[PDB]
Amino acid sequence: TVQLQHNFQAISSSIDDIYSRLDPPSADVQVDRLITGRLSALNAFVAQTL
Amino acid sequence: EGFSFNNWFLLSNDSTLVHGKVVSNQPLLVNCLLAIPKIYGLGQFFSFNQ
Amino acid sequence: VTLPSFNAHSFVNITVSASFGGHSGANLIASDTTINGFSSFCVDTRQFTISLSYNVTNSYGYVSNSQDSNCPFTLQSVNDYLSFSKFCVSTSLLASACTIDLFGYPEFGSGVKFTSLYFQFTKGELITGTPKPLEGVTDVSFMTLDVCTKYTIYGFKGEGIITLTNSSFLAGVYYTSDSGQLLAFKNVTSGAVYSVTPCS
Amino acid sequence: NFRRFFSKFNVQAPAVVVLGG
Amino acid sequence: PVSVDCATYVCNGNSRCKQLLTQYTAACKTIESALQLSARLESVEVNSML
Amino acid sequence: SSNPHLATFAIPLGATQVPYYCFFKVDTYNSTVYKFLAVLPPTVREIVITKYGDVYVNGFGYLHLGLLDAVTINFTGHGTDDDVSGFWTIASTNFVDALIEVQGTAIQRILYCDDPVSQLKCSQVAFDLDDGFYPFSSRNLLSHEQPISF
Amino acid sequence: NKVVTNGLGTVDEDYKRCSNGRSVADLVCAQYYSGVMVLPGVVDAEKLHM
Ligand SMILES: *[C@@H]1O[C@H](CO)[C@@H](O[C@@H]2O[C@H](CO)[C@@H](O[C@@H]3O[C@H](CO[C@H]4O[C@H](CO)[C@@H](O)[C@H](O)[C@@H]4O)[C@@H](O)[C@H](O[C@H]4O[C@H](CO)[C@@H](O)[C@H](O)[C@@H]4O)[C@@H]3O)[C@H](O)[C@H]2NC(C)=O)[C@H](O)[C@H]1NC(C)=O
Ligand SMILES: *[C@@H]1O[C@H](CO)[C@@H](O[C@@H]2O[C@H](CO)[C@@H](O[C@@H]3O[C@H](CO)[C@@H](O)[C@H](O)[C@@H]3O)[C@H](O)[C@H]2NC(C)=O)[C@H](O)[C@H]1NC(C)=O
Ligand SMILES: *[C@@H]1O[C@H](CO)[C@@H](O)[C@H](O)[C@H]1NC(C)=O
Ligand SMILES: *[C@@H]1O[C@H](CO)[C@@H](O)[C@H](O)[C@H]1NC(C)=O
Ligand SMILES: *[C@@H]1O[C@H](CO)[C@@H](O)[C@H](O)[C@H]1NC(C)=O
Ligand SMILES: *[C@@H]1O[C@H](CO)[C@@H](O)[C@H](O)[C@H]1NC(C)=O
Ligand SMILES: *[C@@H]1O[C@H](CO)[C@@H](O)[C@H](O)[C@H]1NC(C)=O
Ligand SMILES: *[C@@H]1O[C@H](CO)[C@@H](O)[C@H](O)[C@H]1NC(C)=O
Numbered sequence A: 001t002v003q004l005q006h007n008f009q010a011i012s013s014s015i016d017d018i019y020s021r022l023d024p025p026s027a028d029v030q031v032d033r034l035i036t037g038r039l040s041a042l043n044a045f046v047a048q049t050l
Numbered sequence B: 001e002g003f004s005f006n007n008w009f010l011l012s013n014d015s016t017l018v019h020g021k022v023v024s025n026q027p028l029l030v031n032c033l034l035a036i037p038k039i040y041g042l043g044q045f046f047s048f049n050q
Numbered sequence C: 001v002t003l004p005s006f007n008a009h010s011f012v013n014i015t016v017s018a019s020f021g022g023h024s025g026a027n028l029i030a031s032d033t034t035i036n037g038f039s040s041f042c043v044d045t046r047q048f049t050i051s052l053s054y055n056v057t058n059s060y061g062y063v064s065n066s067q068d069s070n071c072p073f074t075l076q077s078v079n080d081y082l083s084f085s086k087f088c089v090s091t092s093l094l095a096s097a098c099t100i101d102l103f104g105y106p107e108f109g110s111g112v113k114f115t116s117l118y119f120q121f122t123k124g125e126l127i128t129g130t131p132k133p134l135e136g137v138t139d140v141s142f143m144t145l146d147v148c149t150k151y152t153i154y155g156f157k158g159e160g161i162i163t164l165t166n167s168s169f170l171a172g173v174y175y176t177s178d179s180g181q182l183l184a185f186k187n188v189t190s191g192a193v194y195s196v197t198p199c200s
Numbered sequence D: 001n002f003r004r005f006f007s008k009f010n011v012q013a014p015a016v017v018v019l020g021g
Numbered sequence E: 001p002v003s004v005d006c007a008t009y010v011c012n013g014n015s016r017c018k019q020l021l022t023q024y025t026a027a028c029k030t031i032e033s034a035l036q037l038s039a040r041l042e043s044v045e046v047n048s049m050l
Numbered sequence F: 001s002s003n004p005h006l007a008t009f010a011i012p013l014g015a016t017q018v019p020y021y022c023f024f025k026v027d028t029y030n031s032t033v034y035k036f037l038a039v040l041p042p043t044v045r046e047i048v049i050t051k052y053g054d055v056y057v058n059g060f061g062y063l064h065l066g067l068l069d070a071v072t073i074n075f076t077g078h079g080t081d082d083d084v085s086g087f088w089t090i091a092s093t094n095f096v097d098a099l100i101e102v103q104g105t106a107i108q109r110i111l112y113c114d115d116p117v118s119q120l121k122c123s124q125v126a127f128d129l130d131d132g133f134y135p136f137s138s139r140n141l142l143s144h145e146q147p148i149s150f
Numbered sequence G: 001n002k003v004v005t006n007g008l009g010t011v012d013e014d015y016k017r018c019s020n021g022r023s024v025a026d027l028v029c030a031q032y033y034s035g036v037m038v039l040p041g042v043v044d045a046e047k048l049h050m
Helices: A015-021 A024-049 D003-007 E006-011 E015-022 E027-049 F079-083 F116-123 G015-020 G027-034 G045-049
Strands: B020-034 B044-047 C009-012 C015-021 C027-034 C040-042 C047-050 C053-058 C064-067 C082-090 C098-100 C102-105 C117-129 C148-153 C156-165 C174-176 C182-186 C193-197 E002-004 F022-025 F034-038 F047-049 F055-057 F070-073 F090-103 F106-112 G036-038
Touching: A015 A024, A015 C156, A015 E015, A024 E006, A024 E015, A024 E027, C015 C102, C156 C182, E002 E006, E002 E027, E006 E015, E006 E027, F090 F116, F106 F116, G015 G027, G027 G036
Parallel strands: C009 C047, C015 C053, C047 C117
Antiparallel strands: B020 F090, B044 F070, C015 C027, C040 C082, C064 C102, C082 C117, C098 C117, C148 C156, C156 C193, C174 C182, C182 C193, E002 G036, F022 F034, F047 F055, F090 F106
């Protein structure tokens, strides 16, 4: 849970701000990093659990 | 020890944690405590560096 | 929802006047801009709306104006209930001020930029980049409790359902989750706290 | 006497205080 | 046994984010599948010898 | 009132009944405006300020502006106002790292970190700690006083 | 009793009260709103005693 607050290289730890503040294309760009961070942490958690 | 923090505010910079424990730098070192109950007939110039 | 405060708006304009193109559309003539008629400005009113104005003409024809953004925001976004504890615009270099540039492309495409705009600002609910001078005496905030709704709770955008929670947290205003999610925010105007639930 | 009871608290001379509770 | 909608974890129901999630394909699906497969395995075995 | 510059803050009301708009007048030669400090909250409990301009209100940094030097008071608490003063205690404060236990956004207990046992505790997250082997840093020079080598 | 810091294993609250949302979200609600759901233990301690 605590992983997701880390603003993973993005402008913010939440997404709609990214959508609102900049044009969708760039907002997509930034959110990609958050997306990757979240899933990656999931992966590590998953492997640990397994 | 024994102080109950009748009104003491933890210094949350944006949003306050409701419950838990946090290690942080807060001004808990006490200098020249003044506790005057319901009296201030004073024209005072509190100055730092002193 | 932001801090209770006097209904105060100041229209931000920043007029940019330029002439490009020359002969065969590949030349330039002039370019300048001001923040509401001045080279710099700072918002004091709680509300403020940018109204970008353009006296930009290609001597050969039309000018395509493209926006640069070295800023956490866009001109179309700042008015969208963006919140600051301060916000200042300079036409010249300003320390720790994000950059927004404009590029004027004439019909034959000189490709030049407009003046760099520098925005030194700090987040807060003191002044709000507004789309329109907000209404409401002593408070411009509005909410729909028990309603799945958009919100900007002291800058906390999002979607959720607002339910009065009878809690009486003396300290703090809006408390976030352990996972950095705003769980309850106090009206503070009434000193009452509302829990927020994601709609889905 | 209860004076030792109040002595238990770390304290210094100009500490004009009120114990409560 | 633990479960999580990694789609929600990353997107939190944001459809605009949901499309972006989709392009990373089964990452989320595989994660959840591993979780549930494992968990149901333990469920059935522990119910077995019990 | 909410306008010093359009109206007088000559208050026509007493004992609140209205969250009193707090405005903060700049008093320099080329700036003499009242910045809206804050709508008066229903009840303030504790206020803390810092050298570097931290106007901190009820767990919130309302201003936390550039460094303050003279925090001067003229609270007219004279005459019978000597029994009207809100000043009940004030304590000068130095920042210190400490672990805070809080519940219901209410302070419960504290633990400083200067002591090595306490240093380990605040280095950890729990006031109590278990008997075991714990990482620790060799004590550096307590006085920073780092010479420059170039 | 000495080990279960929660007192009981039953403390895994039904997420329905989480969906209530009238009061402030708890840790269970924090993770649920994040998309996490802890499943009940496959068997209770009473069955283990049995
Ligand atoms: C809300 O968020 C704001 C964001 O800025 C916080 O503001 C900062 O808070 C920190 C917390 O204390 C301040 O840190 C202190 O800075 C003081 C001034 O900085 C000088 O000194 C330090 C350390 O010497 C240098 O690194 C720096 O370059 C400056 O030269 C210092 O006096 C403090 O240091 C103390 O301890 C050190 C040892 O660690 C001693 O050597 C010092 O002599 C001193 O005793 C401390 O570093 C920081 O200054 C604040 N920002 C600004 C711009 O001042 C708010 O605190 C935060 N919380 C609220 C508002 O409640
Ligand atoms: C938080 O709680 C406060 C406390 O009620 C709410 O403030 C209330 O705000 C409304 C409108 O903003 C006020 O209504 C008033 O009604 C009269 C009569 O119709 C009208 O003349 C006024 O112009 C105003 O519309 C109401 O008096 C006021 N209550 C107070 C000050 O005690 C507030 O709306 C709640 N939410 C927020 C986000 O502040
Ligand atoms: C009030 O301010 C004046 C200067 O503005 C100062 O001389 C005086 O000491 C202060 N206090 C009182 C009680 O007058
Ligand atoms: C700060 O304090 C030192 C020593 O007390 C003194 O020499 C110096 O003049 C002071 N400066 C200011 C600005 O108060
Ligand atoms: C800015 O635009 C607003 C309307 O959007 C107008 O009322 C105001 O006069 C303009 N100010 C300047 C300086 O252009
Ligand atoms: C045209 O440009 C001049 C200076 O370049 C400026 O004063 C004027 O406001 C501009 N007109 C418009 C409509 O922006
Ligand atoms: C708060 O408690 C009061 C008194 O029991 C009750 O009437 C009210 O419904 C409660 N509200 C919430 C959100 O718990
Ligand atoms: C205020 O600052 C401006 C900026 O330089 C200066 O021109 C002006 O003279 C100042 N006001 C005074 C000194 O009264």
